[PDB]
Amino acid sequence: SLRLPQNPNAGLFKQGYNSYSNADGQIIKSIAAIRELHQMCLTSMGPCGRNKIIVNHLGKIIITNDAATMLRELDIVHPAVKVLVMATEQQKIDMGDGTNLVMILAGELLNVSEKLISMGLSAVEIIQGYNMARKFTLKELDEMVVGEITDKNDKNELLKMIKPVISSKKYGSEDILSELVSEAVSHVLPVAQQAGEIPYFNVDSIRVVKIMGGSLSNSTVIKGMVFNREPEGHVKSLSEDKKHKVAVFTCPLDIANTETKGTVLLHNAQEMLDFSKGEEKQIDAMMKEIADMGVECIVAGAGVGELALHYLNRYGILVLKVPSKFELRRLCRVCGATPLPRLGAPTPEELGLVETVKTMEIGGDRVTVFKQEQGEISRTSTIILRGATQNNLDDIERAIDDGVAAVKGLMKPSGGKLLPGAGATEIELISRITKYGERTPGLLQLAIKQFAVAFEVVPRTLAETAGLDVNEVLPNLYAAHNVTDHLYKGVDIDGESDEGVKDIREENIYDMLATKKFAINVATEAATTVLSIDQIIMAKK
Amino acid sequence: SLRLPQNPNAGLFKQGYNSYSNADGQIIKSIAAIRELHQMCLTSMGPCGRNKIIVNHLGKIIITNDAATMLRELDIVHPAVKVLVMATEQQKIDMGDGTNLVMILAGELLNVSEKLISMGLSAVEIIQGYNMARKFTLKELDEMVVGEITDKNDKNELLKMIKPVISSKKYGSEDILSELVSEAVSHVLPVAQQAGEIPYFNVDSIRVVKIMGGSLSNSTVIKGMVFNREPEGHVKSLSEDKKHKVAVFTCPLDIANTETKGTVLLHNAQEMLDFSKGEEKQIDAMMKEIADMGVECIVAGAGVGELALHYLNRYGILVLKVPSKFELRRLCRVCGATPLPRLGAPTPEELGLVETVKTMEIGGDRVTVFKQEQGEISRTSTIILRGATQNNLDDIERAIDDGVAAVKGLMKPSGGKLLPGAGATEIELISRITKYGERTPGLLQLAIKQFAVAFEVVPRTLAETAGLDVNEVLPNLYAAHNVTEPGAVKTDHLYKGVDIDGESDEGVKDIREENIYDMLATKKFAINVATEAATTVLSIDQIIMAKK
Amino acid sequence: SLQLLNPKAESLRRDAALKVNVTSAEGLQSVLETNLGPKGTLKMLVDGAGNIKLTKDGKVLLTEMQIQSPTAVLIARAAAAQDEITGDGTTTVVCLVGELLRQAHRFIQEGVHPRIITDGFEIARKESMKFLDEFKISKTNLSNDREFLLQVARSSLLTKVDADLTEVLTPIVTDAVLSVYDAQADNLDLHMVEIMQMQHLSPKDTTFIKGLVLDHGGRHPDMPTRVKNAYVLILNVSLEYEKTEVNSGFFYSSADQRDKLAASERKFVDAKLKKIIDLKNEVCGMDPDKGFVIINQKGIDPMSLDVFAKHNILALRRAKRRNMERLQLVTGGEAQNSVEDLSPQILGFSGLVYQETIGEEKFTYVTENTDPKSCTILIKGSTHYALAQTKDAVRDGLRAVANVLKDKNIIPGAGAFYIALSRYLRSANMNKLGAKGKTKTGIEAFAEALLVIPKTLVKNSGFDPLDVLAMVEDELDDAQDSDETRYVGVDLNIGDSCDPTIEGIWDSYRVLRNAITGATGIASNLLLCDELLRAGRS
């Protein structure tokens, strides 16, 4: 009676494998385990949300409130959390907006199922309850859209899309950060009377170059690109040359050599005297044809030899390394030229135009300014950030990346429209799901009623992070929808929130319709997986 | 595939517990485990047997060829071997003879059983084969007995009993060792012929005193007991003869002390002055009554005070110290005295008679001589054993005890019942059991015929230890038993036996002239214990051990 | 007596090794029995690296989890071989092996020798093969009806995911064959369909494509993404030389030869490109809406990308080895190695060619073919395991619909075949015996062991298997005297019987035939093994 039988299955599989199965654990137990990381995202939600410091094993600190970024750098042993982590990764890659909503909504769907499983409801009927409730949710989101807009052009129309997204992240800045993104979108879009057929837009058209020091209000918008390099050979001519042709060369500037390793073979000394002037006049012939075409700037991705840099300095031709290939195609879109691996001679059709180039220090380090005025740019821009700390500017870049991601999600489909924010949409979905359960009798009514309860976390998080009681302002919000003016009721964050009613159209806080549709589908499937896994199999280490 | 299931559900017992069953050749390993210690006792069998040295954990070395003594100091592991170990110890206690036979016979029954088990014989049928063959064996021993001891004591007849028993244990010289033991036996016999009294004998009566130095030829027989003691007051040769009157006191000689809180109480100086002279008059008054009875020697069982030893030297009374119990108990049997606890005058009827008390140097120390004389015979005589090494003194002491135990076999049964020696007893049983195996129909004849094959170890062991070829000598011995019995009576061919060295080729004619015989009472229990020892091993299908 | 040979050698003889074969098979079955049926459990495989895999198939479970017990290794290798040929039956074989041992182990304790037990298995198995021919129903595949293929393909998908994703994937796995057929040649290959792993839309939003889809995108921006008329030119030669076989070098006397020796390597590149450009304009010149596309198995020189960019030619490099055979079937072209021989006859044809940008990679889509001989299936998922879970569901669904065309006979499922073998193996009369009382012992153990399949299905649904099978025997008794042939199934919804033909549940011929034969040999050798020995040099 001292020692246990150890079970016969101990010899089966290995000792490193761990098993969690129905009645063996899990079953709202493991659901209580993710509540530690769920509470982490609850404090980071909204404009009052709290950022979180994460120190990776490498030592780099990333301070942001984005759930997709935080869960990426964290090493988590619990496997079912990765189901929620990978669910938030899709939100950032595809749509790029609503990563905090997916983690919070999927976490509450498992919390409301705690009462369902405790009542004896099998996980088979739970999956069918959320699937039928998710289809009814997506169908009711179209009738609630008052923000349908056919413009997607004027800068003031972006105040209902880009600005509400910026309101959540770095709430301390509103008109400063919104002007940087709105002006960058106006530059990358082509100027035309009517542009149809869904003009192409990508996240690579707007870039962020972070410079230490300076106030955020001092930031501006540059149509070109700002890279940190060392100019060589001469000072720029400013506007004396006006528009100058820029030739971007993929291959470096040097006498063309074979891929195989060669060497100089000299039989007699007669070729030794001509060997010095031979390499000088050989490369000079290709460099002379470039100056005849009026090319004031040459960009060679690879390293340029000193023999090629010698000739280009006297003619006043700029040389720029651009070691990275990814940023090489970005300068080509500014001037609108074609990258040429061959040397040859520049053709007029394949050369671009740049208004002016200057070298200045924004934060004390010399950078080259590609800004082009009056010129024609296609899908290129940049945003220069000025901040005292590096970690604060990290989330600002992600806030800009999330701002331009909404433009990509707005432009690519037919449209993203608008939805009332600040807890206005989540409360309206509660009355729709609640009444939907009473229409069809059956055992699924338990899963339908609990499906609408999980929607109460979003509007109260704004009140919880504002230092308000969720037992007063939130219950009074449902009475405001009694009955248009009843769909615009929302959560108020202010010292004036005692009334708990503020018109959303005043501040114009709106959310994308396509973002909420993609966030619910991922959050519902993520919570469905946790309930659909009966047995867990682990491994050693 | 990398690691075995390692016998699942084995946690039912402790990891130290192991299970061994007759299956998987473990019953063969048990028989093979017997052969490890069996060959140890094979070279020790017979008069040519070889003694063995065994060193215990304390460093004591006992050199003996006796199987019962060797297995005492050895640490036994295999459980079924302890069955064979404890079987030889019982034979030494009970009959004091035939110890090496039980060790060898019980080991050969398992060797022939290995072939019996291989043929498919069940453990039940094998046990029934030995039990039916042993009952026929015990009946044939009474039919083959020849001669008898008749009278209890004789000079010549005691050479046909003790001498062949002590020939195997420390052979050496024959007549030297036989005369020393045969002399001490005649003294402890009550004789009293024609009176019709029941004879009596004690195996602990004869005591062997080990004294280093000298030679075996210088040994003698002492009618009295010999101890190493130093007289306190004086030494006396007691040449004044007229024998002596001796008394034995199991209690010490001293003033009687209260068992609780003995204390000297003196109220005034008047009682203190007479306290010193008072204790002197107490011993004087008590020892005067003993000296008036003519008691020249007093045997004490504990420490005697100096005040009591003073008056004993005044009258010239010897002092003897007899520690423990058994040493003092056998002293009164010599002189025929009855101990009494009190210090008063002993009863004249309880006084013993010892003619002379001598103290001489034998092994370098003073020993006291209790030896008796022709008249006033005494009992429990001792034998002085002289030797160069102490190791030889230990086994010869046990060799004499083997001859003393042979005298006990002359009391309980009707007679001595001498059997043919030199292995002729076990050889004749081979031809009788062989005919008995054919008379029994069925499958039980396999164990009966092999039961007689186990008796072939006795002639092979005596021939192998003698430096002779067992292939030439053994078949030549069956020529006497292959001719059965002729048309005329008086057949002496039953006396053929195995010879040691010499001219070989059988020999020693008929053993009747050699005078070496065997005891029937010894062979009865030697076969029964050896059979039950091998039967117990074969009756155990599964063996379980602990901690190892 | 083994330790005498080696000190470190261990063994277990007779019942010592017999308890191992019964326990280890029962322990392995107890884990995998919960995965049998549409209501079965879902296992999550998590290794030391953090990878998550959700599958209900025993082939992936036994592969990722190493088995320490030697007894269960035979079951794992038997279930692995079952998945190779038939693509199905991993869980079925595991449940049969452990049941055949437990049923036979009960007779061993009664004094029955394992030799005659193995006799009853072979005699009863041969009788089941004869009943398999009468129980199976032949079908006519010449009509190529959709309704028959939808119900058979759905039955395999119900054992993988829920009914929502099943209805989406059911026409996909039904369309997995389509235009691929041969009447006379009988050759049917499922390796022509391509399994694409990408995260796009949702796992339930995936669709079937009638033409080949490649993962390589346009290397140059000027290459048109959408092409209305494209002629696929298969080129197996590498335009960019990786190395020269014979070691050689360039030794120039003067610097004027440096650009000339560099231009010497430009002639061999332009020599292969000269015949390619002439092939495009050979058909018709100055023809809009007609493009030209090249798919290369080896690498393509980035320097040569501008040569095709001026002519608006799409190029693809680093194609898979299995992609070359699929280009002949889909596009209708012919595989070509070098450019020395070209012609419009060997060029393929495609009605629609377009490319989509998903994430940082671009995928090539080809469709709208006249008589395509091959197709593909795009598997999309919302996470990492969604690609592995759906792939294991499709690959197990491919072999199911293939046996329908390979064998016109279809056997009803839902445990109807296992229950029918119960009543048939009870009394064999004088037909096949071979011994008196020796053979009938092994037959009774094999007959009652075939009932574990229908009982395991009910246990996963949360009902009583004894009450479900009780009404099954009552229906079979009245069906014999009513002169009506009925196939009684097992319904896991209301806990009652059903008809597999009406409910739409069927099983493959090769899956059930190899499961009975495969599980018989594994269980027989374990009953015939009385000793488990381990020896060797470390």
Give the CATH architecture of domain C140-210+373-408: 2-Layer Sandwich (3.30)
Contact A207, A401 (CB under 8 A): no
**Residue for token pair 């970024």:** A69
User: What is the side-by-side strand order in the sheet with C213-214?
Assistant: C213-214, C361-367, C352-358
Cβ separation C10–B4 shorter than 8 A: yes
Minimal-distance CA residue of chain C relative to A522: C382
Structure-block tokens of residue B513: 């002239």
Characterise B333 by phi-psi region: left (phi > 0), alpha (psi -120 to 50), beta (else).
Answer: alpha
Cβ contacts of C485 within 8 Å, gap of 6 or more: C479
To one decimal, the resolution in angstroms is 4.8
- The HSE-up count of residue A518 (CA atoms within 13 Å, CB side) is 26
Q: What is the DSSP letter of C80?
A: H
Interface subset of A 475-504, CB within 8 angstroms of B: none
Amino acid at residue number B427: I
State the DSSP H helix or E strand holding residue B527, giving kind and residue range, or none if neither: helix B520-538
Give the residue among B466, B435, B437, B433 at the shortest CA–CA distance from B452.
B433
Q: Give the Cα separation of B84 and B100 in Å (integer).
A: 12
Report, in angstroms and rounded to the nearest whole number, the Rg of chain B calculated over CA atoms: 30
Task: Classify residue A506 as exposed, middle or buried by CB count within 10 Å of its CB (0-12, 13-18, 19+).
Answer: exposed
> To the nearest whole angstrom, how far is the Cα of C360 from the nearest Cα of chain A?
10
Contact B543, B21 (CB under 8 A): yes
State the DSSP H helix or E strand holding residue C146, giving kind and residue range, or none if neither: helix C146-157
Minimal-distance CA residue of chain A relative to C40: A534
Contact B538, B120 (CB under 8 A): no
Characterise A46 by phi-psi region: left (phi > 0), alpha (psi -120 to 50), beta (else).
Answer: left
Report chain B residues whose CB lies below 8 A from the CB of A4. Answer: 11
Cβ separation A11–B11 shorter than 8 A: no
Q: Give the Cα separation of C61 and C41 in Å (integer).
A: 13
Q: Give the Cα separation of A150 and A60 in Å (integer).
A: 44
Contact B368, B359 (CB under 8 A): yes
> To the nearest whole angstrom, how far is the Cα of B12 from the nearest Cα of chain A?
8
Q: What is the DSSP letter of A92?
A: I
A neighbour chains, 3+ CB pairs within 8 Å: B, C
Q: What is the DSSP letter of B251?
A: S
The 3 state secondary structure assigned to A56-84 is: CCCCCEEEECCHHHHHHHCCCCCHHHHHH
In chain C, ranges of CATH 3.30.260.10 domains:
140-210+373-408
Report chain C residues whose CB lies below 8 A from the CB of A278. Answer: 254-256
Minimal-distance CA residue of chain C relative to B2: C68
Interface test with A, best of C30, C32, C33, C46 (most A CBs within 10 A): C46
- DSSP H helices in A339-386: none
Cβ contacts of C59 within 8 Å, gap of 6 or more: C79, C80, C83, C90
Q: Give the Cα separation of A279 and A485 in Å (integer).
A: 81
> To the nearest whole angstrom, how far is the Cα of B107 from the nearest Cα of chain C?
22
Q: Give the Cα separation of C82 and C520 in Å (integer).
A: 13
Report chain C residues whose CB lies below 8 A from the CB of A539. Answer: 46-48
Cβ separation A539–C164 shorter than 8 A: no
> To the nearest whole angstrom, how far is the Cα of C46 from the nearest Cα of chain A?
5
**Residue for token pair 């137990």:** A29
In chain C, ranges of CATH 1.10.560.10 domains:
1-139+409-538
CA A396 to chain centre: 11
Residues of C with CB under 8 A from a CB of B: 1, 10, 12-14, 16, 19-20, 23-24, 67-71, 73, 532, 534
Amino acid at residue number A134: R
Residues of B with CB under 8 A from a CB of C: 1-9, 23-25, 29
State the DSSP H helix or E strand holding residue C101, giving kind and residue range, or none if neither: helix C90-108
Q: What is the DSSP letter of A91?
A: I
State the DSSP H helix or E strand holding residue A361, giving kind and residue range, or none if neither: strand A358-361
Cβ contacts of B471 within 8 Å, gap of 6 or more: none
Determine what percent of chain A falls in helix, strand and coil, rounding each to the nearest 5.
45, 10, 45
Minimal-distance CA residue of chain C relative to B5: C69
End-to-end CA distance of chain C: 21
Cβ separation B6–A11 shorter than 8 A: yes
Minimal-distance CA residue of chain A relative to B10: A5
Cβ separation C12–B5 shorter than 8 A: yes
Cβ separation B1–C10 shorter than 8 A: no
Residue A16 forms contact with B (CB below 8 Å): no
* Burial annotation B415-430 (CB, 10 A radius, 16+ → b, else e): ebbbbbbbbbbbbbbb
Report chain A residues whose CB lies below 8 A from the CB of B5. Answer: 11
Q: Give the Cα separation of A332 and B51 in Å (integer).
A: 111
**Residue for token pair 């009576």:** B489
Give the residue among B33, B42, B47, B32 at the shortest CA–CA distance from B67.
B42
How many Cβ atoms are within 10 Å of C532's Cβ, its own excluded?
A: 19
Residue B16 forms contact with A (CB below 8 Å): no
The approach used to solve this structure was: cryo-EM
> To the nearest whole angstrom, how far is the Cα of C27 from the nearest Cα of chain B?
13
Structure-block tokens of residue B464: 């192998």
C neighbour chains, 3+ CB pairs within 8 Å: A, B
Interface subset of A 45-64, CB within 8 angstroms of B: none
Number of H helices and E strands in chain C, helices first, is: 17, 19
Give the residue among C399, C380, C382 at the shortest CA–CA distance from C57.
C399
Q: Give the Cα separation of C511 and C86 in Å (integer).
A: 6
When CB atoms are compared, the residue of B6, B8, B25 closest to C19 is: B8
Q: Give the Cα separation of B457 and B110 in Å (integer).
A: 13
> To the nearest whole angstrom, how far is the Cα of A236 from the nearest Cα of chain C?
32
Minimal-distance CA residue of chain B relative to A8: B8
Give the residue among C282, C281, C298, C368 at the shortest CA–CA distance from C330.
C368
Contact A290, A244 (CB under 8 A): no
Longest dimension (CA), chain B: 108
Sign of CA dihedral C453, C454, C457, C462: negative
Cβ separation C1–B2 shorter than 8 A: no
When CB atoms are compared, the residue of C52, C203, C256 closest to A282 is: C256
Structure-block tokens of residue B435: 């005919």
Cβ separation B5–C532 shorter than 8 A: yes
> To the nearest whole angstrom, how far is the Cα of A314 from the nearest Cα of chain C?
23
Characterise C536 by phi-psi region: left (phi > 0), alpha (psi -120 to 50), beta (else).
Answer: left
Q: Give the Cα separation of A190 and A180 in Å (integer).
A: 18
Report chain A residues whose CB lies below 8 A from the CB of B10. Answer: none
Give the residue among B351, B346, B368, B350 at the shortest CA–CA distance from B359.
B368
Structure-block tokens of residue C85: 């040929």
When CB atoms are compared, the residue of A22, A536, A541 closest to C48 is: A541
Cβ contacts of A285 within 8 Å, gap of 6 or more: none
Cβ contacts of A50 within 8 Å, gap of 6 or more: A43, A44, A65, A465
How many Cβ atoms are within 10 Å of B204's Cβ, its own excluded?
A: 11
Cβ separation A258–C52 shorter than 8 A: no
Characterise A418 by phi-psi region: left (phi > 0), alpha (psi -120 to 50), beta (else).
Answer: beta
Cβ separation B11–A6 shorter than 8 A: yes
Residue B120 forms contact with A (CB below 8 Å): no
Interface test with C, best of A75, A529, A531 (most C CBs within 10 A): A529
Contact A64, A99 (CB under 8 A): no
Report chain A residues whose CB lies below 8 A from the CB of B11. Answer: 3-6
> To the nearest whole angstrom, how far is the Cα of B2 from the nearest Cα of chain A?
11
Interface test with A, best of B1, B2, B9, B17 (most A CBs within 10 A): B9
Q: Give the Cα separation of B359 and A209 in Å (integer).
A: 125
State the DSSP H helix or E strand holding residue C525, giving kind and residue range, or none if neither: helix C509-527
Cα dihedral B339→B345→B348→B353 (10° resolution): 60
Residue A8 forms contact with B (CB below 8 Å): yes
Report chain B residues whose CB lies below 8 A from the CB of A12. Answer: none
Contact A533, A98 (CB under 8 A): no
Q: Give the Cα separation of A521 and C382 in Å (integer).
A: 10
Q: Could you give the domains of chain A?
A: 1-148+417-541 (1.10.560.10), 149-223+376-416 (3.30.260.10), 224-375 (3.50.7.10)
Give the residue among C60, C22, C119 at the shortest CA–CA distance from C441.
C119
C1-139+409-538: CATH homologous superfamily?
Answer: GroEL-like equatorial domain (1.10.560.10)
Structure-block tokens of residue A452: 């609408």
Q: Give the Cα separation of A21 and A35 in Å (integer).
A: 20
Cα dihedral B426→B431→B432→B434 (10° resolution): 120
Residue A9 forms contact with B (CB below 8 Å): no
- The HSE-up count of residue B242 (CA atoms within 13 Å, CB side) is 5
Interface test with B, best of C26, C66, C68 (most B CBs within 10 A): C68
Chains A, B: CB contacts within 8 A come to 10
